[PDB]
Amino acid sequence: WVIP
Amino acid sequence: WVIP
């Protein structure tokens, strides 16, 4: 999971 | 396009 990432900060898009 | 890339070499996968």
Place this chain on the structure above:
Amino acid sequence: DSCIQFTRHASDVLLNLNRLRSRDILTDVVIVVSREQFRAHKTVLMACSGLFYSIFTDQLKCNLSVINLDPEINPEGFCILLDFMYTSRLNLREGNIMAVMATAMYLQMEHVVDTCRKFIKASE
């Protein structure tokens, strides 16, 4: 093999699947969550959810145009997860995390359940 790969292909396919959903194009099922209804493509639902994969591979249920979810399922939680299925983006907030996690557990969406557990553990 000796194939070449187009990096953005999978993302572009999903973006177009979401565009089709928004315009109600070739949607083939309505998911009923208490008083709310959500139109979708069976293939996308199966590709994202262990529960939908099970439902639509069933010899009788594969032909249904309406699927009613358990009355304990929160419509907002379902909406957030349906958006995630079609975009890879999860709108996870303090106010919805419990509903999102319970819905992801029911829908059998392991990666969503995992990030919810991690965000909850960080706040305790």
Place this chain on the structure above:
Amino acid sequence: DSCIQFTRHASDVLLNLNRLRSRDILTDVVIVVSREQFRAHKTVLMACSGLFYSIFTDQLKCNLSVINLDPEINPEGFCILLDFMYTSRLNLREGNIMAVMATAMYLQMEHVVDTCRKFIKASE
């Protein structure tokens, strides 16, 4: 928004769509290319091809279960492109490049046409 994103989601969706195709699950159209037939999902075809997007948004053609391609279309070229649609992987070879490019032009798959043009220019 304040969303989080699951990097591998789009790729995992496409991998599952390809698994459904291989098992002939919820495929809703057969593409006929001279003596050969290819089963697929209309939504995936539309999401990858300007030609299929046009065909299946047509008020009459959207309901067809069989689509016959132009007799000049090479089945191997079509097969390579259908595999690309479901995997992001293009099996581009000296022996098939001309057929792949002509098929990609017909199907309106701009990125494939672009890499074919580039590979051809490098060999001249």
